[PDB]
């Protein structure tokens, strides 16, 4: 029976969703960082639980031909790129396999085509938004990212999967915070001023918003700091302050202040302009979010007479992306300011057939149906937990023939598919999309239809 710090020769026989190698020794299932299937390693036992254990590679005996040798290990240990040590073609095959297995094991479905995962051509340097903690590390204010399962900042300048100009702004801000003697936040002490930096840069527009996330309102000589950072980065259009005075894992507090310029940037997606506030949700991989939405559009076979419900519409990106293709878009969104933003974004693009309600999806559907609206397509991008039975039955009660389910969690998608099948919908096609390349994340578009069943 294995002990911690034992060294055992194992063959890696599987890979978890989150990118851990799997070995099976002495009745236990071991999870091993930075170890790929068919690799043979000397494994250092780090921890033994009842049915599972944890290990480390002491030495590679056989390295996989699918290993990417050039990845800095910082990106695995920060969880920035959980699959970054796997060749990109095998990353895609793995995400495809996971979708297929979920549909079979959860929904009992084995006869539906699952397309190979849509990948990114140069799957690096892509995020249009940084959220970096600011902490003192080794006595110096640093920017970086937390080690996995911790709040220990790893100082980083190159974030691998982030816009390099954003990386440069974060470094310039780091150095200005140092020159101006501004103190980083200390979670244990609840001391200091600077908690986080959020930097958004338009993928297409290059417009930059700097958010200083601070514990207190007053930031000494911040006007001179702003004066100098905009000298280095004239593309900065907004310097915002968010005050978070709470002991919480949430990034943002309630109060926002504009210190310079605008309180938003403008960026483009599928040909439309979007005004993006500090706390708005906006896909960080614009290049692949465009392909994701294009996939749902293609699956739904959108016609100019279709009436679309954009369920959980946010600041409007999905419905406004399809608005030019369909008769009417009805968006439901629970957050009123998001509805405000989606109305502004419709107006900015002169889109007049997109209408938003702030309500629950069930109540909006009830009222829309009472108003005579006859939905024909529902586009829904549920949270990780999937849809409720109430939502599924309500969406089915609308009579909508096609439902494009944009999932960030294949497991809850397969569960929801089962109920839609009981309700008379057929699962027609499935397309995984690599929305977050180099990571574990599997995004899936599923087409459900009660036509031709």
Residue numbers in the entry: 1 to 453
What does the paper say about this structure?
RlmCD is a recently identified MTase for ribosomal RNA in S. pneumoniae. Similar to its homologue YefA in B. subtilis, RlmCD can catalyze m5U methylation for both U747 and U1939 of 23S rRNA, whereas these two modifications are catalyzed by two different enzymes RlmC and RumA, respectively, in E. coli. Our structural evidences indicate that RlmCD is a MTase that belongs to the RFM family.
In this structure, each asymmetric unit contains only one protein molecule. The overall structure of RlmCDs highly resembles that of RumA with a RMSD of 1.9Å for the backbone Cα atoms. It is composed of three distinct domains representing the residues 1–63, 128–261, and 281–454, respectively. Most strikingly, compared with those in RumA, the linker regions between α3 and β8 (linker A) and between β10 and β11 (linker B) in the central domain are evidently longer in RlmCD. Careful structural comparison between RlmCDs and RumA revealed the noticeable differences in the lengths of the two linker regions (liner A and B) in the central domains. These two linker regions both have 13 amino acids in RlmCD while their lengths in RumA are 3 and 6 residues, respectively. Given that the overall structures of RumA and RlmCD are highly similar and that they both exhibit MTase activity for U1939 in 23S rRNA, it is quite interesting that RlmCD doesn’t possess an iron-sulfur cluster as RumA, but instead that the corresponding region in RlmCD (residues 72–81) folds as a short α-helix.
